[PDB]
Scaffold this motif. Structure first.
Motif, PDB file in Angstrom:
ATOM      1  N   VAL C 141     -47.475  67.908  15.703  1.00  0.00           N
ATOM      2  CA  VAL C 141     -48.673  67.098  16.009  1.00  0.00           C
ATOM      3  C   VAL C 141     -49.569  67.713  17.080  1.00  0.00           C
ATOM      4  N   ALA C 142     -49.029  68.591  17.922  1.00  0.00           N
ATOM      5  CA  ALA C 142     -49.753  69.186  19.038  1.00  0.00           C
ATOM      6  C   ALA C 142     -50.869  70.169  18.624  1.00  0.00           C
ATOM      7  N   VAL C 143     -50.974  70.543  17.351  1.00  0.00           N
ATOM      8  CA  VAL C 143     -52.085  71.359  16.847  1.00  0.00           C
ATOM      9  C   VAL C 143     -53.390  70.552  16.875  1.00  0.00           C
ATOM     10  N   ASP C 144     -54.527  71.174  17.218  1.00  0.00           N
ATOM     11  CA  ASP C 144     -55.846  70.506  17.249  1.00  0.00           C
ATOM     12  C   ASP C 144     -56.483  70.392  15.847  1.00  0.00           C
ATOM     13  N   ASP C 145     -55.744  69.836  14.896  1.00  0.00           N
ATOM     14  CA  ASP C 145     -56.127  69.676  13.490  1.00  0.00           C
ATOM     15  C   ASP C 145     -56.591  68.254  13.137  1.00  0.00           C
ATOM     16  N   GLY C 146     -56.444  67.303  14.056  1.00  0.00           N
ATOM     17  CA  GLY C 146     -56.758  65.894  13.845  1.00  0.00           C
ATOM     18  C   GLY C 146     -55.696  65.105  13.069  1.00  0.00           C
ATOM     19  N   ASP C 150     -48.217  59.580  13.242  1.00  0.00           N
ATOM     20  CA  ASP C 150     -48.056  58.654  12.122  1.00  0.00           C
ATOM     21  C   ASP C 150     -48.258  59.343  10.761  1.00  0.00           C
ATOM     22  N   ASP C 151     -48.873  60.519  10.722  1.00  0.00           N
ATOM     23  CA  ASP C 151     -48.984  61.351   9.520  1.00  0.00           C
ATOM     24  C   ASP C 151     -47.657  62.013   9.129  1.00  0.00           C
ATOM     25  N   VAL C 164     -41.547  65.152   6.503  1.00  0.00           N
ATOM     26  CA  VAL C 164     -42.120  64.314   5.453  1.00  0.00           C
ATOM     27  C   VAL C 164     -43.475  63.826   5.896  1.00  0.00           C
ATOM     28  N   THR C 165     -44.463  64.015   5.042  1.00  0.00           N
ATOM     29  CA  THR C 165     -45.864  63.709   5.300  1.00  0.00           C
ATOM     30  C   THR C 165     -46.291  62.617   4.345  1.00  0.00           C
ATOM     31  N   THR C 166     -46.889  61.531   4.805  1.00  0.00           N
ATOM     32  CA  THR C 166     -47.399  60.489   3.898  1.00  0.00           C
ATOM     33  C   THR C 166     -48.719  60.887   3.237  1.00  0.00           C
ATOM     34  N   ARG C 167     -49.539  61.690   3.916  1.00  0.00           N
ATOM     35  CA  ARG C 167     -50.730  62.345   3.355  1.00  0.00           C
ATOM     36  C   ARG C 167     -50.364  63.396   2.311  1.00  0.00           C
ATOM     37  N   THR C 168     -51.314  63.771   1.467  1.00  0.00           N
ATOM     38  CA  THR C 168     -51.128  64.822   0.449  1.00  0.00           C
ATOM     39  C   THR C 168     -51.602  66.221   0.861  1.00  0.00           C
TER      40      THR C 168
END
Lengths: 50, 50, 231
Positions: C141-146, C150-151, C164-168
């Motif tokens: 999560v610490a990457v500046d990718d937005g 919770d993703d 595991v990612t809930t986004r695609t």
């Protein structure tokens, strides 16, 4: 120069008439369509759809 | 006196089928050209079978 | 054209198969043209995954797409209060397993220093060898990718782990040495039992949940025979 021009002119004429056609339809379509298959029959079941 | 003898040969036979099926909502809105194309794909699958 | 999509091949609708109404909208990008395990909520309505009743059937929300590959939102079979068919008995053809989100396996070859992951091609900086799971998640999560905490979900208390990612649209990968990342893909298998989960997914794996829904025969076909969830 008109005869040294005439040979270059002849060469360009022959290439143009053999490489070109006039476009009458500005946009051309291409399509991709799928397929289906039979299967071997049985005396009580039914085959798959298409 | 003399002997005599003979024999005989045969061939197989098998059965194949396919289905197509449509809901009422498909038949309500479809172009006849689409169901004609599904028929032609089956006639092509028939030749690739035989 | 590039693709097949799952469909009912045989579906009767005078046996245990039934009309209902959707209790919630179907997500066209995630759930249309897929084999969904469905239950019933505290009202009369069909819901994806276990409702009040548990998994009671399978559903395919059949949706047309334009030549550009996108789906019309103007349909009459995919919003809350729309009618839908649900199957207990039948056959589904062009079958595929149903999965939501993306999942990655991470294994560390290093027993020294630190290893480097990437998120959509931009790096985590440093992950030590022998992290906790929460330290691994934090470095993602610490990457500046937005993308945010919770993703993602992370589990693993060994050199091995899983993201595991809930986004695609988030791809986890390796970029340095000492670590590898495999995306956990899912394909239909011949002769296999399939199970509907409380998520609404369908998978050849049964876990602490997973009612039976059917078995394949040839991998492109599912013979549907739902053994309804029970108290």
């Amino acid at each position: 120069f008109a005869e040294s021009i005439a040979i270059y002119n002849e060469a360009m004429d022959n290439l143009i008439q053999l490489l070109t056609y006039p476009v009458t339809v500005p946009v051309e379509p291409v399509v991709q369509i799928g397929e289906t298959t039979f299967e071997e029959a049985t005396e009580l079941g039914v085959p798959r759809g298409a | 006196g003399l002997p005599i003898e003979v024999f005989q040969m045969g061939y197989d036979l098998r059965h194949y089928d396919k289905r197509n099926a449509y809901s009422w909502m498909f038949l309500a809105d479809a172009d006849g050209r689409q169901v004609e194309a599904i028929h032609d794909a089956v006639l092509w699958a028939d030749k690739r079978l035989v | 054209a590039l693709k097949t999509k799952p469909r009912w091949d045989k579906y009767d609708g005078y046996v245990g198969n039934y009309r209902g109404v959707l209790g919630e909208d179907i997500d066209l990008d995630t759930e249309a043209n897929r084999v969904l395990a469905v239950g019933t909520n505290s009202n009369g309505a069909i819901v994806v995954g276990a409702g009040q009743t548990g998994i009671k059937g399978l559903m395919i929300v059949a949706v047309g797409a334009d030549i550009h590959g996108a789906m019309l939102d103007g349909g009459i079979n995919n919003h809350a209060g729309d009618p839908q068919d649900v199957g207990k008995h039948g056959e589904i053809t062009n079958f595929q397993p149903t999965v939501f989100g993306r999942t990655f396996g991470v294994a560390i070859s290093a027993t020294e220093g630190n290893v480097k992951l990437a998120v959509n091609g931009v790096d985590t900086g440093n992950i030590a060898y022998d992290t906790s799971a929460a330290n691994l998640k934090s470095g993602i999560v610490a990457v500046d990718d937005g993308f945010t905490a919770d993703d993602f979900t992370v589990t693993g208390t060994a050199p091995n782990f899983t993201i595991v990612t809930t986004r695609t649209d988030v791809t986890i990968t390796a970029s340095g040495e000492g670590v590898t990342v495999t995306e956990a893909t899912s394909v239909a298998a011949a002769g296999t039992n399939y199970y509907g989960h409380a998520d609404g997914t369908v998978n050849a794996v049964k876990g602490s949940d997973g009612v039976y829904v059917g078995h394949t025969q040839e991998a492109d076909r599912l013979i549907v025979n739902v053994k309804d969830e029970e108290d």
